[PDB]
């Protein structure tokens, strides 16, 4: 019945706005710049940088950074914090999703673990276009460029960000039809060490039905978006990847910085 | 048009049957499945290993193991020597796929180099079940265990084959479902380099199509299959991304050798 899977979709798509504050539309709508009931700061360098504080609340040193914990090092922190803060969105979310809570305890640990990151470069996406990346709940604007400018090792963290961004934009998905892809990243089951998988998969073929049928209601003209969809699902895992990696980089050159245990604990590599 | 799915599935499921000697249907009837006309030799250990290299049809190396060749060289040598066999089937193959022809040369080059792995690894599913692997045309049969236990670099070559292999076949999908995977795998547009998108796309998007119909009446209650074949592709990705890995580790290992030149030509790389 297609019947139950339209009311799947909508208490998807009505939770996730309960547990998302910034949503892609009214993303869109901030970075279409004909909407200007309210627009953002651009930081497009050094000096935008440090007035970047003047009007906008960046609790961060806005004066000298290299000899004061450097733009570098500061920008990537301030990207880490604000990587937790959607994994506790997401978590919240998470538990929306019917039958997930239902789920030994230790599987729901496993679903979040693998399936954080690949939802925050999803949802990433929404904030950018090829120029750049919303900030500080849209109120800022940091630019690609800025960004790809930064010390040796922190200039090429957000890079594959974009390119992932500007292909899977170029689809046009919007928030209802992100919320049911987002539930069905979480409830996979192919992630290592699940103790009881079919239970995992029989939430998925429904969370896949519901997109399904979803995507073919919200894009009639779009052929194949269901299937162009799921295949993005491998650029996902690959930007995690270089990430870990060029995050342990960091780790042993870096000393001095920490990490939040949140994120290094959803952190065990490989 | 229902009919003109269905007539590009036909179409590539006897290009299937005359492209690719050994069939899924042909291999299961020898594995685990019972039917005993024709038993394969089993290889187990070195000994069993030596006494079928001088045996079985084997038209490369001979039972060689002691300051001669070592058994995990001459078995990676062997595997070299069947995917390469493999790259002629499946670009015979490509070619019957219609549109494929008509595309820019340079795109179906490009097609074939990043397409032909994925394709390799889920053919090779077809002659694997979770205690081997069939070999020589299905004329043997090669242990899991026995290729795990080789020299510490060559002992974890085909285990992720496996672990994909298992989870694959449980789909229990059959030669017509494969003959339009395969298809699919080929037209992918997201391929590095290539020139002309829309085309590949458009012709992806007629595969995916008669993919579908094809899952529906070919598999009426197995839920969801065709989202679940799709999002075995990522896997195919990642074992394709991690093969290539522990090979650059292999390029130091086997190297600096005078007489390897003409033959590390046909070898080239992929």
Same mark, same amino acid.
């Given at each position: 019945?297609?019947?139950?899977?339209? +009311?799947?979709?909508?208490?998807?798509?009505?939770?996730?706005?309960?547990?998302?504050?910034?949503?892609? +539309?009214? +993303?869109?709508?901030?970075?279409?710049?004909?909407?200007?009931?309210?627009?953002?700061?651009?930081?497009?360098?050094?000096?935008?940088?440090?007035?970047?504080?003047?009007?906008?609340?960046?609790?961060?040193?806005?004066?000298?950074?290299?000899?004061?914990?450097?733009?570098?090092?500061?920008?990537?922190?301030?990207?880490?914090?604000?990587?937790?803060?959607?994994?506790?969105?997401?978590?919240?979310?998470?538990?929306?999703?019917?039958?997930?809570?239902?789920?030994?305890?230790?599987?729901?640990?496993?679903?979040?673990?693998?399936?954080?990151?690949?939802?925050?470069?999803?949802?990433?996406?929404?904030?950018?276009?090829?120029?750049?990346?919303?900030?500080?709940?849209?109120?800022?604007?940091?630019?690609?460029?800025?960004?790809?400018?930064?010390?040796?090792?922190?200039?090429?963290?957000?890079?594959?960000?974009?390119?992932?961004?500007?292909?899977?934009? +170029?689809?046009?998905?919007?928030?209802?039809?992100?919320?049911?892809?987002?539930?069905?990243?979480?409830?996979?089951?192919?992630?290592?060490?699940?103790?009881?998988?079919?239970?995992?998969?029989?939430?998925?073929?429904?969370?896949?039905?519901?997109?399904?049928?979803?995507?073919?209601?919200?894009?009639?003209?779009?052929?194949?978006?269901?299937?162009?969809?799921?295949?993005?699902?491998?650029?996902?895992?690959?930007?995690?990847?270089?990430?870990?990696?060029?995050?342990?980089?960091?780790?042993?050159?870096?000393?001095?910085?920490?990490?939040?245990?949140?994120?290094?604990?959803?952190?065990?590599?490989?």
């Amino acid at each position: 019945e297609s019947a139950d899977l339209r +009311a799947l979709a909508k208490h998807l798509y009505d939770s996730y706005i309960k547990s998302f504050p910034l949503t892609k +539309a009214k +993303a869109r709508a901030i970075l279409t710049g004909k909407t200007t009931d309210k627009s953002p700061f651009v930081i497009y360098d050094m000096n935008s940088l440090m007035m970047g504080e003047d009007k906008i609340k960046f609790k961060h040193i806005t004066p000298l950074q290299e000899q004061s914990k450097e733009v570098a090092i500061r920008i990537f922190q301030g990207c880490q914090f604000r990587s937790v803060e959607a994994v506790q969105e997401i978590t919240e979310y998470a538990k929306s999703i019917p039958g997930f809570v239902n789920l030994d305890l230790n599987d729901q640990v496993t679903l979040l673990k693998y399936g954080v990151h690949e939802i925050i470069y999803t949802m990433l996406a929404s904030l950018m276009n090829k120029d750049g990346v919303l900030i500080s709940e849209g109120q800022g604007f940091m630019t690609r460029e800025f960004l790809k400018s930064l010390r040796k090792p922190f200039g090429d963290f957000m890079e594959p960000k974009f390119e992932f961004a500007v292909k899977f934009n +170029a689809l046009e998905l919007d928030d209802s039809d992100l919320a049911i892809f987002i539930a069905v990243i979480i409830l996979s089951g192919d992630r290592p060490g699940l103790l009881n998988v079919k239970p995992i998969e029989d939430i998925q073929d429904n969370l896949l039905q519901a997109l399904e049928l979803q995507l073919k209601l919200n894009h009639p003209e779009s052929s194949q978006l269901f299937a162009k969809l799921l295949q993005k699902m491998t650029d996902l895992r690959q930007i995690v990847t270089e990430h870990v990696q060029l995050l342990q980089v960091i780790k042993k050159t870096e000393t001095d910085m920490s990490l939040h245990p949140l994120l290094q604990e959803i952190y065990k590599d490989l």
